[PDB]
Design a protein around this ligand. Structure first.
Ligand code: ZN
Ligand code: ZN
Ligand code: ZN
Ligand code: ZN
Lengths: 131, 35
């Protein structure tokens, strides 16, 4: 009749509880093993692999495929945020104008020459000086 | 000027990955409850 929590080992006496990974949980005990974030709310998905209960970020950290940056030629980790231009992928900090070194924001206009991101403002002098 | 592109929202490196290891969270209510 009574149910046991798989995160605190105490009996559930609360009004609302959860059911995940063939277990019962107090609303707060269902957390990521690496960061400790609660998985029940915020439209946060639950991931399970090799005994670990993980959030999307920490799952990709442990099991996701890594990519290569078009600017720094260094590996991008699966959990890291990126800017994607066609089939090229960049670290967030490497997504800047190859001319002025300005970091970009949503709504900004640019061109892609090779793997060089050039802002709208700098196209003219880049073309004269490089083609 | 047709070659010009617009900066959008950043994406997750492994956005495609992880569907098969996703597990359901079932919302339940306790039958025996009183204060
Ligand atoms: Zn608990
Ligand atoms: Zn986590
Ligand atoms: Zn980079
Ligand atoms: Zn620029």
């Amino acid at each position: 009749s009574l149910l046991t929590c798989g995160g605190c080992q105490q009996n559930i006496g609360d009004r609302y509880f959860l059911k995940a990974i063939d277990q019962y949980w107090h609303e707060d005990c269902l957390s990521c093993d690496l960061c400790g974030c609660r998985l029940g709310e915020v439209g946060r998905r639950l991931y399970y692999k090799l005994g670990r209960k993980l959030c999307r970020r920490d799952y990709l950290r442990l099991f996701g495929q890594d990519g290569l940056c078009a600017s720094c030629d260094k590996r991008i980790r699966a959990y890291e945020m990126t800017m994607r231009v066609k089939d090229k992928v960049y670290h967030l900090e490497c997504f800047k104008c190859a001319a002025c070194q300005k970091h970009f924001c949503v709504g900004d206009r640019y061109l892609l020459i090779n793997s060089d991101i050039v802002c709208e403002q700098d196209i003219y002098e880049w073309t004269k000086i490089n083609g | 000027v047709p070659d010009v592109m617009v900066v959008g929202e950043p994406t997750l490196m492994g956005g495609e990955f992880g569907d098969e290891d996703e597990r359901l969270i079932t919302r339940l209510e306790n039958t025996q409850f009183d204060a």
